Amino acid sequence: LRPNPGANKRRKRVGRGPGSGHGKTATRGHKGQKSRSGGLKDPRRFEGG
Amino acid sequence: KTYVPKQVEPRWVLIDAEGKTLGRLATKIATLLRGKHRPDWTPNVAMGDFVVVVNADKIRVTGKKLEQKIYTRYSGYPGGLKKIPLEKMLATHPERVLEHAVKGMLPKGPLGRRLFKRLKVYAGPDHPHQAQRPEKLEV
Amino acid sequence: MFAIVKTGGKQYRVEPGLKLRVEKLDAEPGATVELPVLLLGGEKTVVGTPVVEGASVVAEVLGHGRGKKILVSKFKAKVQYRRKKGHRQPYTELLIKEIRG
Amino acid sequence: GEVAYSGRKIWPQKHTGRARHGDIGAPIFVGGGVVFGPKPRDYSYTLPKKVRKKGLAMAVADRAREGKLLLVEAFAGVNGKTKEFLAWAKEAGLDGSESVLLVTGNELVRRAARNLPWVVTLAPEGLNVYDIVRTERLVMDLDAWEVFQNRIGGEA
Amino acid sequence: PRAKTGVVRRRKHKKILKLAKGYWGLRSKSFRKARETLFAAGNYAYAHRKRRKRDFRRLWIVRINAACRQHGLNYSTFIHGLKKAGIEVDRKNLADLAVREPQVFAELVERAKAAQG
Amino acid sequence: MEAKAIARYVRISPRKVRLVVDLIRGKSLEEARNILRYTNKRGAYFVAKVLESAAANAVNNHDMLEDRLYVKAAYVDEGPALKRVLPRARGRADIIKKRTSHITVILGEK
Amino acid sequence: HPVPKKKTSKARRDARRSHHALTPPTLVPCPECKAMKPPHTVCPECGYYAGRKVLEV
RNA sequence: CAGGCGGUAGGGGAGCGUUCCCGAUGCCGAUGAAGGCCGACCCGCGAGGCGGCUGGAGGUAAGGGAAGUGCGAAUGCCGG
RNA sequence: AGUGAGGGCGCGAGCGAUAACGUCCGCGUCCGAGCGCGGGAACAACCGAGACCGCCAGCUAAGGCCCCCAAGUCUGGGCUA
RNA sequence: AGUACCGUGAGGGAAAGGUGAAAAGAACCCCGGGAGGGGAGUGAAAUAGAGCCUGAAACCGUGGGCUUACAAGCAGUCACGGCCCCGCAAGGGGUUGUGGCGUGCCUAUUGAAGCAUGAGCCGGCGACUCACGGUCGUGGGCGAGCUUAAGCCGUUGAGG
């Protein structure tokens, strides 16, 4: 009934939404919802081959 | 610090006008109708002096004469903005030419307003001032 | 009586009243403590004369206590430009009860 | 919850009923489906037996050093009925302001060891750091077994 | 699971109910635009306590000019007066005194004219 | 309180009914009566009757110098409405809700 | 086609409904019996000035 | 003593209520749970106590854990 | 992690008609993204100036002081009218 | 509630949970055609009264306070003066006439007062997660460190 996680352990960054006051999370439209975009690497793949 | 405005403190004054000159005399008459010069001087009034001037007419011209036209464009639009020159200006409404100077600087709708109220003159010769029976302070 | 010395910016022109002014929290570390303000604007009921000497002569002092504090009122920082955040008016002084002289 | 009863379409997502939306009984509204769904689930947690027992141990250790009742012996209850068991308690000095974890195969021990207060009924070589430090004092019988088990914990 | 934030917002909002004093009909109970109108009022009091300084600046400015000149000479003059003026030169009262102790002003003056020379 | 003149679910109407009481209050049964009775338009009896009970509650279990009962404080309230729907070209739903009226008017003694 | 813009508050609504306002009904007493009679008229009682010819049955 | 402190995108820190899980139910409570209605002591704030009225029974945390959560706002969704 | 397009002003070349609140590039400032205060009437970028919060305190920029509105209808010497 | 109701059929596919502790839920008298309205009794309450618990916002209403017919302004709001209010005073409330200064917020903008837009008003719903792979951090166990599938004990089901 006392031993709270010592140092930091407990949730460190499950930061919700975008900013206390404001909010939005990132850039411009290019990364909307169904927006898991140009994934791992475009020109990097060029290299790959 | 504080320092609140007194109470019904009334003072009037007689101004020559005649001989004196246009604008400048205005600047004067002008600020004269203070609201700032005697104690508790400010927004809600103060002096401004119920000031009245005569011989309003016979004023000296800023050396211009003609080339100074007041306007009255009540105009039902596409009407006339009635251009008028100082000459006749006074000829019929001198007390007014000065007037335009006066309002000229008098500000604030309701207030300044009230001040013109405590601002009266007559290009009449003086007798008018007489009609204003009351005290007769002077300069 | 109504005399003038003033402090931290001219906090004065008075007589014996709890005329609370500025936070000179030094002798405040003790409730009704006392202390002097170097005159400047020496003038009391008929005898009126000089702020030089005010800078250099008699001083006045009070017996004071209390404080005052945060005095409510808030202020929100926003700009049409797209934003807003705000807080409360924190201000005070242990206040003075006037000691003549 | 759409798939099947997904209401295909109903708003002329045309351009006049002013309104947007093609699908009825759609997520974003009226008692329909909700965002990041309350998916049935479970919290597995293979927490390394290493320190797991290491601790069960540590907890046992402190809890006990403050108040430790390694019985090995006890007897007061018709083989262990309530009333008589109680007497025992008064004997073992166990009263109100006390909660102890009764732990071990002395099944007559569990048998009488009910009662919401004072005692908690644990007749198994079933232990756990929690119940451990949470139960005022450890009280247990077949401690030959126990202490030795904990040791097994000690060196595998 | 659950999360009827209701409790909460009904609250946050009445809070707002008060935030809103009882402004001009509609921007009064105006929840939304109420709030808005408020942000306004906010930045406003802002501006307010902010500059009330200059406000006084002037206030006295004139009250006093009023007196100094009423007497003998305007600001360049009078001011400059308290200026040349030695271990004595204060302001947040020039007015005050001009007012309260007619003598007070008459002479702060006297000396001051001299103060300049 | 005093002579209560009020009642529920009768589908007359807000504003108008308010007009009536507007004009009839002030004075007493005598005068406001004459007006409520011989002045034209609906409400007429609705109003009048409400008056009546008011007065009965009055000299009956409030009693007071009957003759001087004068409407004191009063006016109206409207509860729900019948939600009716009509036709208005190219179909479309044209809605309406007639006012089911309740009156809050009190007779006061003086 | 020309649906206003908003509603200058109950404020306005009133401005109007207001100059509107509901006046009251003209009356003196029966030239014959009592009660209220509007100028030229008779009624379910007196009903006349020269021959009731009206009321009671 | 520095010494700085407009500042969205965006990155870091630090707190806030919020309904549940232990709550090692402590209980609190018909001299009210709760939501509500109003208020010139608490908070740098998100919030807090506390006082007064309603209101019919809950509610809950000392410390820590779990999240359908905090919303003008999307010609939004449902009802007025 | 975010912008991956932006504009304005000054100088330096394009271009354009040596036109445009044009568009091309560069050095700088800029303005957004702080650039919320002064300000020039009022005016995102022109001169002043960086606002953590107070003050019924005082010294100053730019740029101002007959009045409308704080501040000499300063003084001195001219020249237009 | 798969019934209302739209569709030709295929097919779509609502809403409405609570009076009170128990019915004692309203004899009876009074305006009235009636509803419904005042009384008596109910009772601990009936602002617990039949759509009838808790029953707030919105909007309309009855009364009271201040306020208003030479006025040009989102808003406001700093100041002050006149009212009225709790007040022991300190003073604290609400109300404003005089004046100073003040382009409303959201989105996407080099760029907004917008004449670009979103925005009818209230209320409840309303959107960066979960599973793993990983990956970097960093809080914790030993350096070789950790354990799936299972067999077994398992109110608590106890972990091995």
GROMACS .gro file of C-alpha atoms in nm, chain D residues 12-120:
model
  109
  301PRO     CA    1  -2.749   1.130  -5.110
  302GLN     CA    2  -2.392   1.221  -5.050
  303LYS     CA    3  -2.480   1.396  -5.369
  304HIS     CA    4  -2.467   1.762  -5.293
  305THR     CA    5  -2.799   1.908  -5.180
  306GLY     CA    6  -2.933   1.777  -4.855
  307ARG     CA    7  -2.634   2.001  -4.775
  308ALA     CA    8  -2.517   1.715  -4.548
  309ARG     CA    9  -2.217   1.490  -4.580
  310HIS     CA   10  -2.218   1.118  -4.512
  311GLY     CA   11  -2.286   0.811  -4.734
  312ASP     CA   12  -2.319   0.535  -4.469
  313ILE     CA   13  -2.597   0.518  -4.205
  314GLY     CA   14  -2.559   0.372  -3.864
  315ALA     CA   15  -2.214   0.511  -3.913
  316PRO     CA   16  -1.930   0.538  -3.660
  317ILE     CA   17  -1.920   0.907  -3.597
  318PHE     CA   18  -2.274   0.927  -3.466
  319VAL     CA   19  -2.585   0.811  -3.283
  320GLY     CA   20  -2.518   0.498  -3.074
  321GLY     CA   21  -2.332   0.338  -3.362
  322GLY     CA   22  -1.979   0.204  -3.346
  323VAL     CA   23  -1.721   0.393  -3.136
  324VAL     CA   24  -1.359   0.495  -3.204
  325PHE     CA   25  -1.073   0.276  -3.080
  326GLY     CA   26  -1.300  -0.002  -2.972
  327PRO     CA   27  -1.321  -0.163  -2.632
  328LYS     CA   28  -1.169  -0.487  -2.769
  329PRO     CA   29  -1.208  -0.794  -2.550
  330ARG     CA   30  -0.852  -0.859  -2.414
  331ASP     CA   31  -0.612  -0.981  -2.140
  332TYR     CA   32  -0.288  -0.881  -1.971
  333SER     CA   33  -0.044  -1.171  -1.996
  334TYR     CA   34   0.291  -1.077  -1.837
  335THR     CA   35   0.574  -1.333  -1.826
  336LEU     CA   36   0.765  -1.142  -1.554
  337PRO     CA   37   1.101  -1.327  -1.513
  338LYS     CA   38   1.067  -1.587  -1.239
  339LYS     CA   39   1.418  -1.468  -1.143
  340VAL     CA   40   1.344  -1.152  -0.960
  341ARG     CA   41   0.972  -1.250  -0.935
  342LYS     CA   42   1.044  -1.507  -0.666
  343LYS     CA   43   1.351  -1.310  -0.556
  344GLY     CA   44   1.099  -1.056  -0.438
  345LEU     CA   45   0.813  -1.280  -0.322
  346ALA     CA   46   1.106  -1.367  -0.102
  347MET     CA   47   1.221  -1.015  -0.005
  348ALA     CA   48   0.854  -0.929   0.089
  349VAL     CA   49   0.817  -1.247   0.290
  350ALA     CA   50   1.147  -1.147   0.461
  351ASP     CA   51   1.059  -0.800   0.576
  352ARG     CA   52   0.692  -0.868   0.651
  353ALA     CA   53   0.811  -1.156   0.872
  354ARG     CA   54   1.106  -0.988   1.044
  355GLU     CA   55   0.851  -0.732   1.166
  356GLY     CA   56   0.587  -0.988   1.250
  357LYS     CA   57   0.663  -1.353   1.171
  358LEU     CA   58   0.454  -1.653   1.271
  359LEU     CA   59   0.635  -1.957   1.121
  360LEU     CA   60   0.412  -2.195   1.320
  361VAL     CA   61   0.546  -2.543   1.237
  362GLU     CA   62   0.323  -2.606   1.538
  363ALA     CA   63  -0.022  -2.499   1.648
  364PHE     CA   64  -0.337  -2.664   1.775
  365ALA     CA   65  -0.662  -2.520   1.922
  366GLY     CA   66  -0.987  -2.611   1.754
  367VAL     CA   67  -1.155  -2.958   1.745
  368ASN     CA   68  -0.881  -3.064   1.503
  369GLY     CA   69  -0.949  -2.700   1.418
  370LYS     CA   70  -1.313  -2.577   1.448
  371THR     CA   71  -1.390  -2.206   1.460
  372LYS     CA   72  -1.461  -2.124   1.832
  373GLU     CA   73  -1.166  -2.332   1.955
  374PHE     CA   74  -0.948  -2.212   1.668
  375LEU     CA   75  -1.036  -1.865   1.802
  376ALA     CA   76  -0.919  -1.960   2.149
  377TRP     CA   77  -0.599  -2.066   1.982
  378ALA     CA   78  -0.582  -1.719   1.837
  379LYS     CA   79  -0.610  -1.557   2.178
  380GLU     CA   80  -0.324  -1.793   2.263
  381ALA     CA   81  -0.108  -1.718   1.960
  382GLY     CA   82  -0.188  -1.362   2.064
  383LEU     CA   83  -0.398  -1.292   1.753
  384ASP     CA   84  -0.663  -1.027   1.800
  385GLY     CA   85  -0.862  -0.760   1.620
  386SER     CA   86  -0.599  -0.511   1.513
  387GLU     CA   87  -0.435  -0.788   1.314
  388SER     CA   88  -0.463  -0.950   0.975
  389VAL     CA   89  -0.257  -1.250   0.898
  390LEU     CA   90  -0.210  -1.468   0.599
  391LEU     CA   91  -0.266  -1.827   0.707
  392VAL     CA   92  -0.058  -2.034   0.466
  393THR     CA   93  -0.008  -2.416   0.446
  394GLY     CA   94  -0.149  -2.765   0.399
  395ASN     CA   95  -0.293  -2.784   0.746
  396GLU     CA   96  -0.635  -2.816   0.602
  397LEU     CA   97  -0.804  -2.808   0.937
  398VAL     CA   98  -0.606  -2.484   0.958
  399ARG     CA   99  -0.768  -2.344   0.645
  400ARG     CA  100  -1.092  -2.519   0.756
  401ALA     CA  101  -1.137  -2.294   1.060
  402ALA     CA  102  -0.929  -1.999   0.919
  403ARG     CA  103  -1.230  -1.820   0.747
  404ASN     CA  104  -1.371  -1.512   0.925
  405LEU     CA  105  -1.350  -1.185   0.721
  406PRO     CA  106  -1.139  -1.015   0.993
  407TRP     CA  107  -0.820  -1.112   1.166
  408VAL     CA  108  -0.752  -1.406   0.940
  409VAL     CA  109  -0.727  -1.481   0.578
   0.00000   0.00000   0.00000
